[PDB]
């Protein structure tokens, strides 16, 4: 629609696309099956969102209040951009960097930014895989090593779970400033993670294609096992109702919509550019549309499936704490008044509080009672990676077959993380080949950069990258891809090739969806990001053992220097889109 003179020749002609398939059997790779492509894409998407981010934000928004906005954007801004990416990869027969080069010469930044974002998110996601496999290794003992203290003061104020995470595993320091040595047992696990990645992404899609059978199927088989056990847990269907009860109060916060926005681009693996390359290996007459719709259906479904399984365990543990809490309140009274054991129950607590008060108030006042409310136990959200290493790992210890429940849960989190890495590796390896050995150079170079997360401060370093690398950059790239396919390449041209490829054209509704709303929605999330960042002073949670109210969120502000690290991680990739565009207009 805007000036694009000489777009032809730069891009394969539709007349030549029939004659470019049978000849290009050698020098470009090919999917062994249709399912080996569909499985790979599914693995990557579900593996990238449900591995940690999705389950975190669900429980960090109280359920429904996050899912509703997430699903709204999952259809309006998700489905469009998932179809757009498959279609444009199958037409231009190039990876992410080639597609934006062919469409327009100065549109290099898009492909470059997509490679930087894919590198950055994969850097700190393989640390989470290291942490996951640490727990997996430590998950082969009848007494799970986080089930009891070694009692130590920290572990007493904290839980046998909180101590295993912050002390036994992270050895966390008080600040990002205080950065100790490379935790050695963490380095072994980091090496193990980056190694098995190399083992599965050695030749690229051929070798990964045979990995994605077990890797894309296990997470599911295990996620269904965790539903049947999930719903047998006492507190499930109290927490499920809780999940189904959203709070409009959270909805009226632009943050909930921003986090829902950024999660669409995570749950759909969009603006990483690893899906474009995947479709670039299909037949030119392969129905990407059908494929995109199927993927969108399975994604939404699996997200809701996980949310249900998470809140099941949440509800169970919350009910457990309610019943343990209320038992202690019963114990205090029964002790201070020598009541016959079991005379006071949940049925007769409050009437025996006042009764015994009247009987002996001087000998009742000294009694101390906690505010044992089940509802609060559900609204008690965990920050960071705590849903897997503090909520699930504890609930598992109060479930018979705790060790099995530990190994099943951390295998399904590895598989999910590994299938996510496959698509992240494709969005950095391919853009390098377009600009085994190269794979290995990337597998070892990154592994070396992954040492910052094996420090004592290494968990606070992870928090920044997760809050920036996987945030605004994705939205911007996501906005551009939509803009540069419709207003630079022409939606009208794009409709012709759609018909040449799938054999038909998109519904008018779906055309309009990527035509106006989806671009519009991206801009809305963009504004939301700007507002929250400016409206809130940059800070972070620390774990300082031995401070006033130790088992509380101590939320110190980052040093000035961290903000430099912040203005870079969220800046450099996005700036490559304007930056290169200007550089090409002055060359």
């Amino acid at each position: 629609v805007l000036p694009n003179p000489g777009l032809d020749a730069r891009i394969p002609s539709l007349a030549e696309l029939e004659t470019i398939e049978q000849e290009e059997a050698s020098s470009r790779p090919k999917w062994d099956n249709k399912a080996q492509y569909m499985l790979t894409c599914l693995g990557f998407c579900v593996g990238l969102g449900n591995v940690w981010r999705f389950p975190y934000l669900c429980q960090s928004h109280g359920g429904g209040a996050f899912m509703i906005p997430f699903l709204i954007l999952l259809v309006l801004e998700g489905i469009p951009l998932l179809y757009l990416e498959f279609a444009i990869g199958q037409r231009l027969r190039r990876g992410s960097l080639g597609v934006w080069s062919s469409i327009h010469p100065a549109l290099k930044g898009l492909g470059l930014a997509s490679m930087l974002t894919s590198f950055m998110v994969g850097l700190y996601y393989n640390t989470i895989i290291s942490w996951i496999m640490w727990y997996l290794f430590n998950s082969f003992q009848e007494p799970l090593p986080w089930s009891d203290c070694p009692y130590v003061d920290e572990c007493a104020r904290s839980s046998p779970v909180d101590y295993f995470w912050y002390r036994e595993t992270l050895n966390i320091s008080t600040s990002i400033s205080d950065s100790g040595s490379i935790q050695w047992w963490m380095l072994l696990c980091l090496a193990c993670a980056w190694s098995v990645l190399y083992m599965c992404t050695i030749r690229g899609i051929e070798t990964t294609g045979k990995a994605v059978y077990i890797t894309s199927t296990l997470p599911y088989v295990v996620l269904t096992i965790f539903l049947i056990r999930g719903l047998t847990l006492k507190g499930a269907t109290n927490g499920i109702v809780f999940l189904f009860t959203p709070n409009v109060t959270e909805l009226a916060q632009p943050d909930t919509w921003l986090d829902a926005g950024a999660q669409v681009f995570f749950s759909f693996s969009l603006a990483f550019g690893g899906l474009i390359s995947f479709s670039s290996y299909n037949s030119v007459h392969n129905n990407c549309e059908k494929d995109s719709v199927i993927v969108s259906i399975i994604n939404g479904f699996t997200s809701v499936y996980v949310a249900i399984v998470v809140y099941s365990v949440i509800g169970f543990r919350a009910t457990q704490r309610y019943d343990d809490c209320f038992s202690t309140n019963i114990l205090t009274l029964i002790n201070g008044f020598d009541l016959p054991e079991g005379n006071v129950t949940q049925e007769n607590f409050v009437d025996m509080q006042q009764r015994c008060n009247a009987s002996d108030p001087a000998a009742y006042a000294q009694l101390v009672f906690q505010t044992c409310d089940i509802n609060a136990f559900l609204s008690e959200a965990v920050e960071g990676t705590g849903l897997a290493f503090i909520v699930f790992t504890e609930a598992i210890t109060k479930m018979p077959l705790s060790p099995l429940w530990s190994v099943l849960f951390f295998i399904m989190l590895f598989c999910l993380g590994l299938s996510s890495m496959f698509g992240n590796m494709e969005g950095v390896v391919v853009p390098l080949q377009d600009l085994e050995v190269l794979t290995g150079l990337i597998c070892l170079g990154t592994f070396l950069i992954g040492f910052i997360f094996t420090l004592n401060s290494g968990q606070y370093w992870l928090s920044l990258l997760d809050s920036y690398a996987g945030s605004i950059p994705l939205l911007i790239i996501a906005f551009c891809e939509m803009f540069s396919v419709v207003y630079v390449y022409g939606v009208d041209r794009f409709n012709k090739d759609i018909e040449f490829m799938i054999g038909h054209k998109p519904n008018i509704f779906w055309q309009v969806t990527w035509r106006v709303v989806s671009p519009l929605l991206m801009l809305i999330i963009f504004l939301f990001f700007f507002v929250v960042e400016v409206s809130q002073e940059l800070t972070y949670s620390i774990w300082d053992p031995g401070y006033e109210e130790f088992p509380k969120s101590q939320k110190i502000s980052y040093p000035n220097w961290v903000y430099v690290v912040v203005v870079i991680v969220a800046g450099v990739p996005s700036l490559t889109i304007p930056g290169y565009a200007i550089y090409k207009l002055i060359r």
Binding site: M133, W134, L136, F137, N138, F140, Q141, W185, L188, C189, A191, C192, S195, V196, Y198, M199, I202, R203, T207, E436
Partner: peptide, 29 residues
């Protein structure tokens, strides 16, 4: 250590896999 011994086993099989895979490529001629 249980975690160490499991780690060792996993590493071994993974690196052996890698070695076999790279050698398999060498075999491909």
């Amino acid at each position: 250590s249980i975690w160490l011994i499991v780690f060792g086993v996993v590493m071994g099989v993974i690196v052996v896999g890698i070695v076999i895979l790279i050698f398999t490529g060498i075999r491909d001629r």
